[PDB]
């Protein structure tokens, strides 16, 4: 009766884009990205993947309330290297990693019997 | 009767009660478009306005404090200290 | 239903307390919380 | 009321399994244990869906119009 609709978990609403970007006040070269309509399925993913890149100082995420799907990824990075790339470069790294995982799995799926 | 501007004990400090009903009593004026007697540095709530009028001691109100024998004392809100 | 058909009330010593002689006539556990606590009993 | 499709906690379709579960209980003498295993039900969530279900529909039907 007060329940929120079950499609509000992956659809967006109105005047609600899937990425908000904002500069963190506390630290220099720092950024806090709000993800509408997403969660741990790819919060935890980017964060640990935004960690293997040596040009990053800081990288964390958090679901403020498991009531609404929105997690905030905050990132600070080295002098110069703007985080908007940091995210990109990582977001891509993943694409490849999975892209490879698909074919490799494809190869071995076609070896088996039954 | 009356009690002079002198011979006053009465705590010079603002009672938590006194103060809350000052904030309130101004908020009731500020909520019905009566003029704001300080610069409102970007706040719009008639409660949060009063809190600035008080930080800046610009509330033209007096307290009347009653001593249980039927005597009383007057206290301008510019006169009282706001600690707490 | 099974229980409400087997209920025992008592109107008005210490009558709510589970008594030795209740052993295997009244249920020791089954009685309602507060209000008429223990005064009602189940077989 | 009838065998649930799919098992609440795991997801394995269990609907089809009912009428099956009954025979290799009683056609070829088997204990409810082994019967749940021939039917592919290896997880206990996905075993409890069937071990427990009381088929109340059969008794429902007994009424007439």
């Amino acid at each position: 009766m007060n329940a929120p609709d079950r499609f509000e978990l992956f659809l967006l609403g109105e005047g609600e884009s899937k990425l908000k970007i904002d500069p963190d006040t506390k630290a220099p070269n720092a950024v806090v990205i709000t993800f509408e309509k997403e969660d741990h399925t790819l919060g935890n993913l980017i964060r640990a993947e935004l960690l293997n890149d040596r040009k990053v100082l800081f990288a964390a995420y958090k679901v403020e309330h498991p009531f609404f799907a929105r997690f905030k990824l905050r990132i600070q990075t080295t002098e110069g290297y703007d985080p908007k790339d940091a995210l990109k470069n990582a977001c891509n790294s993943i694409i490849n990693k999975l892209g490879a995982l698909k074919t490799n799995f494809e190869t071995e799926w076609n070896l088996q019997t039954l | 009767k009356a009690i002079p501007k002198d011979q006053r004990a009465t705590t010079p400090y603002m009672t938590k009660y006194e103060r809350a009903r000052i904030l309130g009593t101004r908020a009731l004026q500020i909520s019905m478009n009566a003029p704001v007697f300080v610069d409102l540095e970007g706040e719009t709530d008639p409660l949060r306005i009063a809190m600035k009028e008080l930080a800046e001691k610009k509330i033209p109100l007096v307290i009347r404090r009653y001593l249980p024998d039927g005597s009383f004392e007057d206290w301008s809100v510019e006169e009282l200290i706001v600690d707490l | 239903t099974l229980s409400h058909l087997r209920r025992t009330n008592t109107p008005i010593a210490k009558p709510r307390q589970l008594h030795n002689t209740h052993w295997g006539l009244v249920c020791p556990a089954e009685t309602p919380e507060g209000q008429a606590c223990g005064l009602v009993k189940n077989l | 009321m009838i065998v649930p499709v799919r098992c609440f906690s795991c997801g394995k379709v269990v609907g089809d399994k009912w009428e099956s579960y009954l025979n290799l209980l009683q056609e070829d003498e088997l204990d409810e244990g082994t019967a749940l295993s021939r039917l592919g039900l290896k997880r206990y969530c996905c075993r409890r869906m069937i071990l427990t279900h009381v088929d109340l529909i059969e008794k429902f039907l007994r009424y007439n119009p």
């Binding site: - | - | 058909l5 209920r7 025992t8 009330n9 109107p11 009993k41 | -």
Partner: protein
């Protein structure tokens, strides 16, 4: 499954809850409080069944 120990009245089932009462024809002794001149009393609720 309905084992039925009720009556129907105006549609709604109704249960008669078994009432409790100290029995009759005994015959007991009750040590009575100090500010009572009455020390012991042997009580007996008498009625014909």
């Amino acid at each position: 499954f309905d084992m039925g120990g009720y009556f129907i009245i105006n549609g709604s089932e109704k249960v008669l809850i078994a009432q409790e009462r100290s029995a009759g024809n005994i015959v007991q002794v009750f040590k009575k409080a100090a500010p009572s001149p009455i020390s012991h009393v042997a009580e007996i609720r008498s009625a014909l069944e």
